Ligand binder design. Structure first.
Ligand SMILES: [Zn+2]
Ligand SMILES: [Zn+2]
Ligand SMILES: [Zn+2]
Ligand SMILES: [Zn+2]
Length: 206
């Protein structure tokens, strides 16, 4: 049920932000390879005018997925969930902005401060951890941050559009693709977060 899906763990109830790297670090971008999270799975090029399925948060070039639906096959090409029409998609300017910085229409080093705005939760001011996306407007937050926020508001923290008339948790989804590209881009973030969890569970055994 919904109550179990978004119940926060003992760790999650006390978690604190993963603070941004602001020291001048540059990350390495390889020539002639893509991060697969930034690749359209239909045309196999970097995403162009990214559109994202509301139900399953899968990304495609706008033209690729609109054309795919005109085959008559009304499903998501990535997971095969039903996809009624292009109104089941939303524009993803965050992915577009990330791509424009990592793959400038082609440098080998990128300042992580240039990427940070696209990888950070505005509620805690740190990097996304268990990124979770409001499906109507495609704004994203840490799981714990948005779950706690929606206990006292039914409106998006960023754009203020009502998430749901009565139960906002119905209209959020875990965003694996966003969290995966965050962990791939931010050095040490996955390692640091898993260490925090291990340290917590060791201090609170059961
Ligand atoms: Zn494409
Ligand atoms: Zn899908
Ligand atoms: Zn957060
Ligand atoms: Zn929003």
């Amino acid at each position: 049920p919904l109550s179990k899906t978004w119940e926060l763990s003992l760790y999650e109830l006390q978690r604190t932000p993963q603070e941004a790297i602001t020291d001048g670090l540059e990350i390495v971008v390889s020539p002639r390879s893509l991060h697969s999270e930034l690749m359209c799975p239909i045309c196999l090029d970097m995403l162009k005018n990214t559109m994202t399925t509301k139900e399953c948060l899968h990304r495609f070039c706008a033209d690729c997925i609109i054309t795919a639906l005109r085959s008559g096959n009304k499903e998501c090409p990535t997971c095969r969930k039903k996809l009624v029409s292009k109104r089941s998609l939303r524009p993803d300017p965050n992915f577009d902005a990330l791509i424009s910085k990592i793959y400038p229409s082609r440098t080998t080093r990128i300042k992580i401060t240039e990427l940070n705005p696209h990888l950070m939760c505005v509620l805690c001011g740190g990097y996304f951890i268990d990124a979770t996306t409001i499906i109507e407007c495609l704004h994203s937050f840490c799981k714990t941050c948005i779950v706690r926020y929606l206990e006292t508001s039914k409106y998006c923290p960023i754009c203020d559009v009502q998430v749901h008339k009565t139960r906002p948790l119905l209209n959020i989804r875990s965003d694996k693709t966003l969290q995966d590209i965050v962990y791939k881009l931010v050095p040490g973030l996955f390692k640091n977060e898993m260490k925090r969890r291990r340290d917590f569970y060791a201090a609170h055994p059961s």
